[PDB]
């Protein structure tokens, strides 16, 4: 049928999608800026569609409830037909690939540790062997699922602690995890993706840092409902943008050119 | 019912075992991709036969004839059912074959003989005393051929017309050329292979500078193959179980050939 505006689900996660200054008097896609806003424009141009950016209503990436089997977050928006495509830092995972399609990755990441500067922690093993410093993850995302499913001794030990810690060590948004690191005097460390960690390390007041190696290696992909006719063109567009150097330039633009912690 | 796997002799992905002359079939070979093939086949429920690509190439399309060679060609022309190899995901290949999600990350990188006064691709481009080149019929050569980045296009203009040829038939021949050229040849190759060689005797090469791009290897199937979906889920399962990282640690294991 006739071309229709593509509904893009995304999430307010800096620097991927952020409210522009003066957003209160802007409308539509002009309200937003960031890496995924720029990426959406490039994908749409290469694939020949018009689109509307829509922030996921529940503010979540996406997890399946173990009891009801209902998917929430951006994954749910695709599964239940509320959006046509997700352009966001959405991690490629097995359980998600069983229900939605992903392009080839547009960005690499691994799970990593964020500390308040000076915290005496260098690794996941360090965290797992002590109790003074609490630690947790984002809710409803791939990092929490990683720990829940891991059979690796250190990560299983970490999960066994996190799942029963009181008060809860889990946070609803990345910003809440950052705040908890910044306000806890070295007594909370946050497990989050290396991309987000490296972004925050360049934001004022420059009081956090990434420590240790990454715990895994994976990527973000552009997601579509299973069988969607958009998937093929989106995939080729991701590969073209990578090969032309545009994805690397976009990361530099939003992470480092705009950094607030020096050159 | 036996799946024909095309692969390539490239250390440490696929290597001939010691005493392979008295072995047969899949038991002749060892390495990262041999172990990976066994894991993929177990998860997908197929029997398979490893076969070394007949022309020894990864795969490129002839500009005049438009015929594909290498492992890509074996998939395109129906000579193999799947490629399990360090085969780079690229746009031109994704137009003719299918790739799983990546099983390993890499980028193009620079190999020098230790002590060579080169720190970056920009350094190479701004001089002519030290020659440099790439593997033929692979994704690194195509990267330079297609690139519009000023530094890389300048490098391509030099490499394509340099005499004698700066291109090599196999990775091992590029490494040998670095080792034998007294610092007058640098080799552009994928970071995975570079890092493997840097930890092998005689410990006379090193990786310099950052990677020039970021990409991955995928398991490839002919377009529309029924195996693609299961293979893709298998790669993700193996990654999430930690087995891909374990295999990398096994086959890049440093036994101290170089230093402590
Ligand atoms: C950025 N980019 C451009 N597109 S691409 O050429 O397809 C490509 C392939 C691989 C990677 C390296 C990072 C990664 C991403 C995703 C996964 C991984 C590993 N592994 C190692 C396991 N499987 S995965 O799909 O979760 C990046 C990449
Ligand atoms: N990128 C993750 C969210 C962040 C996290 O879990 O650390 C996801 O897609 O679920
Ligand atoms: N992995 C490459 C071969 C090595 C190279 O080109 O440096 C390919 O798939 O073509
Ligand atoms: Cl419309
Ligand atoms: Cl032998
Ligand atoms: Cl298993
Ligand atoms: Cl078999
Ligand atoms: Cl440029």
From Swiss-Prot, chain A:
GO terms for cellular component: AMPA glutamate receptor complex; asymmetric synapse; axon; cell surface; dendrite; dendrite cytoplasm; dendrite membrane; dendritic shaft. The modification Phosphoserine is found at residues 150, 184. Ionotropic glutamate receptor that functions as a ligand-gated cation channel, gated by L-glutamate and glutamatergic agonists such as alpha-amino-3-hydroxy-5-methyl-4-isoxazolepropionic acid (AMPA), quisqualic acid, and kainic acid. L-glutamate acts as an excitatory neurotransmitter at many synapses in the central nervous system and plays an important role in fast excitatory synaptic transmission. Induction: Down-regulated in the pyramidal cell layer of CA1 in the hippocampus by global ischemia. Glycans are attached at residue 3. The M4 transmembrane segment mediates tetramerization and is required for cell surface expression. It comes from Rattus norvegicus (Rat). Disulfide bonds join 206-261. The postsynaptic actions of L-glutamate are mediated by a variety of receptors that are named according to their selective agonists. This receptor binds AMPA (quisqualate) > L-glutamate > kainate. The record marks 64, 148, 240 as: Interaction with the cone snail toxin Con-ikot-ikot. The lineage of its organism: Eukaryota, Metazoa, Chordata, Craniata, Vertebrata. This is Glutamate receptor 2. Belongs to the glutamate-gated ion channel (TC 1.A.10.1) family. GRIA2 subfamily. The record marks 121 as: Crucial to convey clamshell closure to channel opening. Detected in forebrain. Detected in dendrites of neuronal cells. Expressed in the pyramidal cell layers of CA1 and CA3 and in the granule cell layer of the dentate gyrus. Keywords: Cell membrane, Disulfide bond, Glycoprotein, Ion channel, Ion transport, Ligand-gated ion channel, Lipoprotein, Membrane, Palmitate, Phosphoprotein, Postsynaptic cell membrane, Receptor, Signal, Synapse, Transmembrane, Transmembrane helix, Transport, Ubl conjugation. The gene is Gria2.
């Amino acid at each position: 049928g006739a071309n229709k505006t593509v509904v893009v689900t995304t999430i307010l996660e800096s620097p991927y999608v952020m409210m522009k200054k003066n957003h209160e008097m802007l409308e539509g896609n002009e309200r937003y800026e960031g890496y995924c806003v720029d990426l959406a424009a490039e994908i749409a141009k290469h694939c020949g569609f018009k689109y509307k950016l829509t922030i996921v209503g529940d503010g979540k990436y996406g997890a399946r409830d173990a009891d009801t089997k209902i998917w929430n977050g951006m994954v749910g928006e695709l599964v239940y037909g509320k959006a046509d495509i997700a352009i966001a830092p959405l991690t490629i995972t097995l359980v998600r690939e069983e229900v939605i399609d992903f392009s080839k990755p547009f960005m690499s990441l691994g799970i990593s540790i964020m500390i308040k500067k000076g915290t005496p922690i260098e690794s996941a093993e360090d965290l797992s062997k002590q109790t003074e410093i609490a630690y947790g993850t984002l809710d409803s995302g791939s990092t929490k699922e990683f720990f829940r499913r891991s059979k690796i001794a250190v990560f299983d030990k970490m999960w066994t602690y996190m799942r029963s810690a009181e008060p809860s060590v889990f946070v609803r948004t990345t910003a809440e995890g950052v705040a908890r690191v910044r306000k806890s005097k070295g007594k909370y460390a946050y497990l989050l993706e290396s991309t987000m960690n490296e972004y925050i390390e360049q934001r004022k007041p420059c009081d956090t840092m990434k420590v240790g190696g990454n715990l895994d290696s994976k990527g973000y992909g552009i997601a579509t409902p299973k069988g969607s006719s958009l998937g093929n063109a989106v995939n080729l567009a991701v590969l073209k943008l990578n090969e032309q150097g545009l994805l690397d330039k976009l990361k530099n633009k939003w992470w480092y050119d705009k950094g607030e912690c020096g050159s």
